[PDB]
């Protein structure tokens, strides 16, 4: 039976990578350090198991937590429980990128930064520093057992993130679950919510109730992680709670319902909660579902690297100046050149882009200006000054007037580009 | 409304604040904002703030200069440098729209950290006092802030002032905005609803309004150091 | 073996705090604990009480069946050394790209990869599974 080995291997080194993201992010995590969650720092390179042991450890924590608080359970706190025990999920994962060439590889900020791969990037340095999740791919999380189009809900924390929606019906085996975004704790208000036309026709009291900071025991920092195996439990058992300090009698009538549908229940779960599922590294798979939202614009497309939204839109020259001043505002050099080999540009393109007042950079800032902002478009300022396009020494008229290349170049602390402004 | 405009100078002439005539009217408004800092976060989004302000500024009929990324020492040199500018001396009032990241004692540059670089708040008021800076005396002052996370000669020396600041410690960490900031955006819808129909204070007051939203109600634009002694209206036109 | 019980989540569903659960909540309770049983598979072992209530003790006894134990490390040892004719303690990335690419689970191959970097810390292209193991377990 050799393949039963090799079954053997690839799990293995798949609970190897995991126990790497789960490494990285209890070690590197300073909220896990305020609460006494935080795990030490491999002094190898790679990092043992216990990073993986730890997830389960902290898991029971929370779900003990939980239990403690609501053990005393009611007929309707039990069928409800029962009810989300044996619902499955969809994990769904938005972008306006195509991550699917009938693979589904889809990776995360740091594996994406790891092979420098020209993409959007919604992660920000202070998420990096205080949780360390940007080694994880996150999804929303659905209700599954239903006949319904697939696309239930379509924001996460009232944010879209792409019209091109993947979604996944099995669970990772060492991803895990937070009731909320893992950075942000709070539950947005109704004002936001995607569906609140259901739960202000039908219900009262919840409206207000619902804005709160799911926390732990130990306060508002505490964000409650679960792990696959108590993903469901921990859920339930939050609603329930949720449930039960809610005043809104309708609510606590309608979520009872031992008769419930699964789509109430999806709208329940990502009312009350805004769940959010992490699966570690990459996500490489065969079954996978794309839904098409809704059309992507160009400065979507531009910032998402979408090549082929891009060739789909960019027909002409005008449509040229739109893209390639996009292109400058959002540092995607890949798409700047990949327009100035598509099409040719000269000072008469430079010109109508400085007259293009329906473009924000171009109606905001100058071409020079754009092309010295940061080091990131070194390369097109090269093309834009070897080839004549734009001449160096020209002082800024809109932003910044009196200025020139060289102080934005100063600013930026880009050697090459400083280096290259002086010799030219 | 240009019926009402004529109408609210002759009713209240000593009460409200005078308004030069749209010919050699020179109506200046500065903008400066920090979208990039050498060891801070960057202000991501702020091409939405600056484009938002800027029109607002230019349908009242003020010329808009943009500078941006700016140490504190070059916003003081700006401010200075936007106050020697004679085209004041024709003009009626003026805007600054400072936003970066700004601590409780001011704005910081693009530098700032161990090291330093904030432009004091009251360091503004003192360019743009009645003593340093006559060309903008008795005239309105509003000041607008964008930031994250004797002592009697100050009450007579800064006159005509205004401040509406915004202290949402966002520092992308609320991270949940949709192209543009929230005080931003409401400070645009309001000055397009209830600029025609209100004095300046009133519109800066029903923005606070709008942050009664359970999650965004401490949100609330704090009104700082007003030094006006009428009442600023501003007309569409 | 067992250590800490799962009296908890039979605790939940236990209604009257007989210490017994209905035949019918018996899925739920081992789901709530991470074990998936099929329809089949709860029936056959719902004849253990031929009433429809099911105590703690005959609980218990079915976890352990379904334990699923994971690959222990010398398990691990000994998947790798079936692929390693010269008992060199080594294998190329190639060898172990043929292993995961042509054997067992059919796999994308843009999982192979990062598996095969995961294996190979030091670049050369050569993995030593030996002092993997004995690293990820400690
Ligand atoms: N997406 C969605 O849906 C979500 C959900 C939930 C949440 N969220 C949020 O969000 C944020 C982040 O974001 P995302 O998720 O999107 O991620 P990122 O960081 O941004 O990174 C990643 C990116 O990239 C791309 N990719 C992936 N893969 C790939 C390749 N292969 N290529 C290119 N690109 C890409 C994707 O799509 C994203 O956008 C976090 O923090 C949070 F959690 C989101």
């Keep these: 039976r050799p393949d039963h080995c090799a079954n053997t291997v690839k799990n293995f080194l798949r609970k190897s990578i995991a126990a790497q993201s789960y490494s990285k992010m209890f070690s590197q995590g300073t909220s896990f350090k305020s609460l006494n969650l935080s795990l030490e720092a491999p002094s190898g390179a790679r990092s043992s198991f216990r990073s993986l ?16 608080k609501v053990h005393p359970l009611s007929s309707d706190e039990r069928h409800l429980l029962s009810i989300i025990i044996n619902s499955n999920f969809n994990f769904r994962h938005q972008s306006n990128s195509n991550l699917s060439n009938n693979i589904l590889n889809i990776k995360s900020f740091d594996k994406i930064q790891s092979e420098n791969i020209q993409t959007h990037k919604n992660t920000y340095s202070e998420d990096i520093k205080e949780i360390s999740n940007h080694d994880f791919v996150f999804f929303g999380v659905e209700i599954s057992n239903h006949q319904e189009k697939l696309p239930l809900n379509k924001t996460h924390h009232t944010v879209d993130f792409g019209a091109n ?35 202000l026709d039908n219900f009262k009291e919840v409206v207000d109730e619902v804005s709160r900071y799911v926390h732990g025991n130990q306060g ?36 009872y319902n031992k008769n419930i549908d699964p789509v109430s229940l999806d709208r329940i779960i990502n009312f009350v909660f805004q769940l959010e599922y992490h699966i570690p590294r990459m996500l490489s798979t065969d079954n996978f579902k794309k839904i098409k939202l809704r059309d992507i614009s160009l400065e979507d497309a531009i910032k998402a690297s979408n090549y082929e939204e891009i060739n789909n839109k960019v027909t002409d020259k005008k449509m040229a100046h739109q893209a390639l001043a996009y292109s400058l505002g959002n540092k995607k050099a890949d798409i700047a050149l990949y327009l100035l080999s598509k099409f040719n540009f000269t000072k008469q393109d430079v010109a109508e882009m400085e007259k293009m007042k329906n473009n924000r950079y171009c109606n905001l800032y100058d071409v020079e200006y754009l092309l010295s902002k940061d080091g990131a478009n070194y390369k097109v300022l090269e093309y834009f000054i070897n080839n004549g396009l734009v001449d160096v020494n020209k002082k800024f008229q809109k932003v910044n007037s009196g200025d020139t290349m060289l102080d934005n170049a100063m600013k930026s602390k880009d050697s090459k580009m400083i280096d290259f402004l002086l010799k030219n | 409304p240009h019926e ?10 000593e009460e409200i604040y005078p308004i030069k005539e749209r010919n050699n009217r020179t109506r200046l408004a500065l903008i400066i904002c920090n979208t990039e800092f050498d060891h801070l976060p960057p202000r991501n989004g702020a091409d939405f703030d600056i484009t938002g302000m800027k029109e607002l500024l230019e349908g009242l009929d003020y010329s808009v200069d943009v500078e941006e990324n700016l140490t504190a020492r070059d916003m003081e040199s700006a401010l200075r440098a936007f106050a020697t500018r004679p085209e004041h001396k ?21 530098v700032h950290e161990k090291k330093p670089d904030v432009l004091l708040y009251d360091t503004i008021f003192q360019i743009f006092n009645n003593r340093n800076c006559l060309s903008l005396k008795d005239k309105p002052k509003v000041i607008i802030v964008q930031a994250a996370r004797d002592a009697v000669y100050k009450t007579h020396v800064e006159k005509d002032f205004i401040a509406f600041c915004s202290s949402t410690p966002h520092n992308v960490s609320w991270r949940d905005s949709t192209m543009g900031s929230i005080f931003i955006t409401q400070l645009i819808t309001c000055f397009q609803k ?16 709008s942050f009664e939203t359970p999650r965004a109600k401490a949100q609330m634009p704090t009104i700082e150091r007003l030094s006006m002694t009428r009442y600023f209206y501003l007309f569409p036109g | 073996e067992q250590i800490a019980e799962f009296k908890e989540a039979f605790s939940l569903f236990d209604k009257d705090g007989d210490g017994t659960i209905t035949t019918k909540e018996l899925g739920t309770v081992m789901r709530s604990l991470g074990q998936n049983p099929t329809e089949a598979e709860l029936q056959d072992m719902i004849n253990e009480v031929d009433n429809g209530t099911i105590d703690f003790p005959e609980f218990l006894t079915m976890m352990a069946r379904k334990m699923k134990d994971t690959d222990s490390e010398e398990e691990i040892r000994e998947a790798f050394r079936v692929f390693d004719k010269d008992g060199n303690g080594y294998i190329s990335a190639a060898e172990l790209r043929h292993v ?39």
């Excluded at chain 2, 003026?94 to 704005?107: A, D, N, P, R």
Aim: some cysteine; overall charge negative; aromatic content about 12%.
């Design chain 1, 53 to 68: 042991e730890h997830l389960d450890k902290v898991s029971r924590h929370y779900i003990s937590e939980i239990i403690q």
């Design chain 1, 165 to 199: 929606a993947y979604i996944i019906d099995h669970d990772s085996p060492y991803g895990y679950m937070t009731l909320t975004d893992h950075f942000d704790n709070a539950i947005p208000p109704v004002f936001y919510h995607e569906h609140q036309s259901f739960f």
């Design chain 2, 4 to 13: 009402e405009f004529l109408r609210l100078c002759k009713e209240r002439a």
């Design chain 1, 220 to 255: 508002k920092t505490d964000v409650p992680i679960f792990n696959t195996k108590d993903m469901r439990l921990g859920i339930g058992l939050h609603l329930i709670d949720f449930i039960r300090k809610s005043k809104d009698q309708g609510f606590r009538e309608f979520c």
């Design chain 2, 194 to 209: 209830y600029s025609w129909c209100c004095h300046l204070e009133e519109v800066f007051r029903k923005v606070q309004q």
């Design chain 3, 100 to 138: 995961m690419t042509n054997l067992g689970e059919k796999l994308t191959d843009e999982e192979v990869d990062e598996m095969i970097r995961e294996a190979d810390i030091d670049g050369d292209g050569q993995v030593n599974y030996e002092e993997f193991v004995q690293m990820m377990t400690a």
């Design chain 2, 90 to 110: 024709s003009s009626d009032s003026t805007f600054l729209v400072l936003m970066s990241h700004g601590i409780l004692e001011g704005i910081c540059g693009t």
